[PDB]
Amino acid sequence: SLRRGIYHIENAGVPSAIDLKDGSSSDGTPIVGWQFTPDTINWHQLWLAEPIPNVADTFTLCNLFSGTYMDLYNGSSEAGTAVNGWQGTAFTTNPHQLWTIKKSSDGTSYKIQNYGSKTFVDLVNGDSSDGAKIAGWTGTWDEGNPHQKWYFNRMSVSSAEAQAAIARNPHIHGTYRGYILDGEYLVLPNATFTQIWKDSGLPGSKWREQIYDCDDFAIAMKAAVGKWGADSWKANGFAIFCGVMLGVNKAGDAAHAYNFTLTKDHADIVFFEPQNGGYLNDIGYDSYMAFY
Amino acid sequence: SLRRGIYHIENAGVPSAIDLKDGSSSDGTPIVGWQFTPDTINWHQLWLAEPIPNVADTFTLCNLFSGTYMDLYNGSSEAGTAVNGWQGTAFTTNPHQLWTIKKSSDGTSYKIQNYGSKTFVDLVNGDSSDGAKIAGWTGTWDEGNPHQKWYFNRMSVSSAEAQAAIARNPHIHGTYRGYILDGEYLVLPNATFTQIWKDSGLPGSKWREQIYDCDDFAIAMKAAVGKWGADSWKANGFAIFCGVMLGVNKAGDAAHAYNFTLTKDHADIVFFEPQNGGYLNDIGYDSYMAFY
Numbered sequence: 001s002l003r004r005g006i007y008h009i010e011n012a013g014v015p016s017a018i019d020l021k022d023g024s025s026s027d028g029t030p031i032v033g034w035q036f037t038p039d040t041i042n043w044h045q046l047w048l049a050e051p052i053p054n055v056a057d058t059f060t061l062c063n064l065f066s067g068t069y070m071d072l073y074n075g076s077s078e079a080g081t082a083v084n085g086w087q088g089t090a091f092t093t094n095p096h097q098l099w100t101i102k103k104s105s106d107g108t109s110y111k112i113q114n115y116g117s118k119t120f121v122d123l124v125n126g127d128s129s130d131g132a133k134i135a136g137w138t139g140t141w142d143e144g145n146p147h148q149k150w151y152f153n154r155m156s157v158s159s160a161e162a163q164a165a166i167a168r169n170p171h172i173h174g175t176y177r178g179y180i181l182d183g184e185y186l187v188l189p190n191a192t193f194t195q196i197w198k199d200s201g202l203p204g205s206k207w208r209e210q211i212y213d214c215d216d217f218a219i220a221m222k223a224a225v226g227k228w229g230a231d232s233w234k235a236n237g238f239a240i241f242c243g244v245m246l247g248v249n250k251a252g253d254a255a256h257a258y259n260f261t262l263t264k265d266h267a268d269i270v271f272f273e274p275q276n277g278g279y280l281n282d283i284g285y286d287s288y289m290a291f292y
Numbered sequence: 293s294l295r296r297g298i299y300h301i302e303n304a305g306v307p308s309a310i311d312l313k314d315g316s317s318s319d320g321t322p323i324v325g326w327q328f329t330p331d332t333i334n335w336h337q338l339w340l341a342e343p344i345p346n347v348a349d350t351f352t353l354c355n356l357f358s359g360t361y362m363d364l365y366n367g368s369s370e371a372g373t374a375v376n377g378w379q380g381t382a383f384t385t386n387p388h389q390l391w392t393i394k395k396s397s398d399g400t401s402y403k404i405q406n407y408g409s410k411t412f413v414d415l416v417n418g419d420s421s422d423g424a425k426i427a428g429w430t431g432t433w434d435e436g437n438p439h440q441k442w443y444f445n446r447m448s449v450s451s452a453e454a455q456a457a458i459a460r461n462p463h464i465h466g467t468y469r470g471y472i473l474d475g476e477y478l479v480l481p482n483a484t485f486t487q488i489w490k491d492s493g494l495p496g497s498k499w500r501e502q503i504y505d506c507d508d509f510a511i512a513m514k515a516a517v518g519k520w521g522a523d524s525w526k527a528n529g530f531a532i533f534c535g536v537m538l539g540v541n542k543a544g545d546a547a548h549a550y551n552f553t554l555t556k557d558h559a560d561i562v563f564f565e566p567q568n569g570g571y572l573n574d575i576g577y578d579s580y581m582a583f584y
């Protein structure tokens with residue numbers, strides 16, 4: 001089963017991702033194929049898959065930027081029916097906006113079937129051009145046709161996944177406690193994480209004993225990523241990943257506050273030093289507390 | 293013994309506090325008597341008393357706003373010698389800037405004696421006028437003379453005092469852990485705490501599921517008080533008091549993030565709701581975590 005989370009949805013045939021054109025909130029905004037840059041935020045190309053209760057393998061897909069939903073126009077079963085952004089809700093009963101998403105015959109990519117029409121999301125003609133039509137189209141669950149096959153490239157972690165990544169780290173103190181704030185987090189590329197650090201003005205902040213020392217940098221960095229999340233995205237029902245940790249050194253006579261993010265592969269954490277913007281596999285402290 | 297911390301220093305004879313005139317960082321800025329408003333920040337009238345090691349009952353007094361030090365001009369023992377703000381350091385050996393501070397004969401107020409001159413800080417003529425001279429003056433440790441007697445009205449708590457105030461609260465969960473970030477905190481009047489909440493723009497923030505929900509409000513409020521502290525005060529070696537808590541309800545099926553401050557008398561905590569700016573003795577959750 002596809003898990004609740006944020007996905008970059010990439011065609012199995014050509015390197016085109018599902019793109020809400022200009023990220024418009026306008027009803028009837030075309031959803032198209034568009035080229036993408038890896039290890040960035042692809043601003044118009046992120047989709048929040050919300051599972052529907054009591055309806056197997058079926059979801060809403062909410063554009064993270066627009067807060068509008070993938071919508072089969074008038075729910076038509078006609079081949080070539082437009083797939084657009086449209087206003088909706090996370091648990092709608094509008095079958096225009098309900099998508100059964102299951103593994104293709106290749107066992108890695110998925111097919112996206114409209115719950116109402118039973119037609120499939122199709123990159124018409126396998127066109128790799130920026131702005132290529134995406135439509136609802138006849139097809140089957142089993143066929144190889146790559147026009148209708150999509151890699152769901154997972155951009156988020158559950159809190160349980162974030163907890164596993166921390167637990168895998170060697171720099172966790174024996175007294176560690178971890179405090180979970182949210183359920184599902186968008187993992188940032190380091191490029192973006194760094195940019196939010198710059199845009200916060202933390203690079204200009206001077207260390208001052210107690211009045212602006214390591215706890216103040218680490219908590220400011222988390223607030224800045226919180227603020228960036230609300231101000232950047234119109235969808236709800238997720239957070240941005242940015243941890244705070246308190247750590248103790250080896251001698252056990254010095255504590256230090258810092259941040260942490262997650263690796264590309266979501267498997268491990270990386271320490272961030274909000275006083276200089278360094279990423280470290282070893283920040284010279286072992287964490288006895290985290291909140292994220 | 294006077295404890296390390298921040299004091300509003302008020303004359304025992306008349307309601308004049310020790311005031312660095314216009315809060316100037318200029319060397320030779322006059323220190324004067326000036327009327328004050330209770331339960332505000334008295335911006336020019338707060339002094340950080342730093343104890344000197346191996347020198348009994350002797351301190352630097354750093355103006356919290358200017359970051360400059362109370363200084364007996366040329367360390368003269370002549371009656372009427374000017375007491376000014378001057379550049380210095382927290383553990384100077386400059387005896388112009390070193391002050392032996394011990395209880396008066398009334399056992400509540402203190403006398404302030406220059407370590408070098410052995411003359412006392414004196415509100416000349418007990419003049420209650422705004423801008424009245426304060427000078428180094430002959431006198432004794434035992435005499436009643438209220439010109440040379442000063443209430444040290446304590447505005448800060450140790451981390452140990454903040455810990456005692458939390459532990460006295462009935463709304464602490466059995467699983468509570470508390471994480472201490474700093475050593476000495478300026479306690480804010482609710483008026484100021486509220487104003488920092490307004491100036492943050494949190495009153496305009498909408499609750500949004502995960503993306504800006506209670507953890508985001510509470511952490512934003514703490515960052516805003518951190519920022520206000522650094523941006524407002526030129527002294528170092530203290531923090532501003534603003535706690536985060538995570539709490540669980542009575543049913544044990546709902547968690548909520550919020551802030552907490554301290555009472556006037558420093559003895560108890562009060563819960564703050566950063567989504568509406570309410571102060572509450574009972575926020576309907578019991579804290580299982582705090583950092584402050």
Ligand SMILES: C[C@@H]1O[C@@H](O[C@@H]2[C@@H](O[C@H]3O[C@H](CO)[C@H](O)[C@H](O)[C@H]3O)[C@@H](O)[C@@H](CO)O[C@@H]2O)[C@@H](O)[C@H](O)[C@@H]1O
Nearest residue numbers: 079122123124125126127137138139140143145147148
């Ligand atoms: C290259 C082409 O692939 C298949 O064609 C696709 C179309 O496939 C889908 O629709 C057709 C009917 O037109 C049929 O229902 C099929 O089962 C289904 O997968 C469709 O993807 C369009 C739009 O992108 O492009 C191609 O026409 C196949 O039917 C053709 O024989 C041929 O191999």
Ligand SMILES: C[C@@H]1O[C@@H](O[C@@H]2[C@@H](O[C@H]3O[C@H](CO)[C@H](O)[C@H](O)[C@H]3O)[C@@H](O)[C@@H](CO)O[C@@H]2O)[C@@H](O)[C@H](O)[C@@H]1O
Nearest residue numbers: 371414415416417418419429430431432435437439440
């Ligand atoms: C009202 C006045 O109080 C005492 O006088 C103070 C001064 O007191 C201090 O200085 C005097 C010498 O001038 C003396 O050394 C005394 O022990 C010491 O406390 C001083 O505070 C000035 C400046 O504010 O005001 C008064 O003159 C006392 O000596 C007087 O007899 C008289 O009772």
Ligand SMILES: C[C@@H]1O[C@@H](O[C@@H]2[C@@H](O[C@H]3O[C@H](CO)[C@H](O)[C@H](O)[C@H]3O)[C@@H](O)[C@@H](CO)O[C@H]2O)[C@@H](O)[C@H](O)[C@@H]1O
Nearest residue numbers: 019020021022023034035036037040041042043044045
């Ligand atoms: C917000 C906007 O993002 C970029 O433009 C998008 C564009 O982005 C994708 O395609 C570009 C090349 O056109 C790159 O491969 C990016 O990595 C992709 O994310 C598309 O989403 C189109 C169609 O909706 O909209 C554009 O606004 C970027 O080029 C802009 O500078 C800007 O940051």
Ligand SMILES: C[C@@H]1O[C@@H](O[C@@H]2[C@@H](O[C@H]3O[C@H](CO)[C@H](O)[C@H](O)[C@H]3O)[C@@H](O)[C@@H](CO)O[C@H]2O)[C@@H](O)[C@H](O)[C@@H]1O
Nearest residue numbers: 027071072073074075084086087088089092094096097
């Ligand atoms: C059968 C039809 O279903 C709904 O209309 C859809 C429409 O639905 C969404 O957008 C409208 C506003 O246009 C409302 O906000 C709905 O709540 C949304 O779910 C879209 O799906 C478009 C494009 O496919 O098709 C319409 O038919 C409903 O609003 C109508 O009243 C009607 O019952």
Ligand SMILES: C[C@@H]1O[C@@H](O[C@@H]2[C@@H](O[C@H]3O[C@H](CO)[C@H](O)[C@H](O)[C@H]3O)[C@@H](O)[C@@H](CO)O[C@H]2O)[C@@H](O)[C@H](O)[C@@H]1O
Nearest residue numbers: 311312313314315326327328329332333334335336337
């Ligand atoms: C920063 C400044 O603070 C206030 O003015 C100070 C003044 O403040 C004290 O005296 C006033 C009345 O003059 C009130 O009692 C305040 O409660 C006191 O804190 C003094 O510190 C003088 C001498 O250095 O400087 C003034 O700037 C306030 O009146 C101003 O509006 C302003 O906020």
Ligand SMILES: C[C@@H]1O[C@@H](O[C@@H]2[C@@H](O[C@H]3O[C@H](CO)[C@H](O)[C@H](O)[C@H]3O)[C@@H](O)[C@@H](CO)O[C@H]2O)[C@@H](O)[C@H](O)[C@@H]1O
Nearest residue numbers: 319363364365366367376378379380381384386388389
């Ligand atoms: C004996 C004298 O002590 C110092 O000068 C003081 C002066 O000290 C402070 O300010 C100066 C700059 O004027 C330096 O930063 C010192 O480090 C500070 O401690 C003030 O206390 C004034 C006013 O009472 O008196 C001067 O005599 C020292 O700097 C001199 O060299 C000299 O040794």
Ligand SMILES: [Ca+2]
Nearest residue numbers: 181182505507
């Ligand atoms: Ca939350």
Ligand SMILES: [Ca+2]
Nearest residue numbers: 210213215474
């Ligand atoms: Ca601090």
Ligand SMILES: [Ca+2]
Nearest residue numbers: 213215473474
């Ligand atoms: Ca600290």
Ligand SMILES: [Ca+2]
Nearest residue numbers: 182502505507
């Ligand atoms: Ca949140």
Ligand code: NA
Nearest residue numbers: 052055056057
């Ligand atoms: Na389901």
Ligand code: NA
Nearest residue numbers: 344347348349
């Ligand atoms: Na001492």
Ligand SMILES: [Zn+2]
Nearest residue numbers: 074075096116
């Ligand atoms: Zn319909």
Ligand SMILES: [Zn+2]
Nearest residue numbers: 013125126147
């Ligand atoms: Zn093709």
Ligand SMILES: [Zn+2]
Nearest residue numbers: 170171285286
């Ligand atoms: Zn380690």
Ligand SMILES: [Zn+2]
Nearest residue numbers: 214255256257
């Ligand atoms: Zn540190």
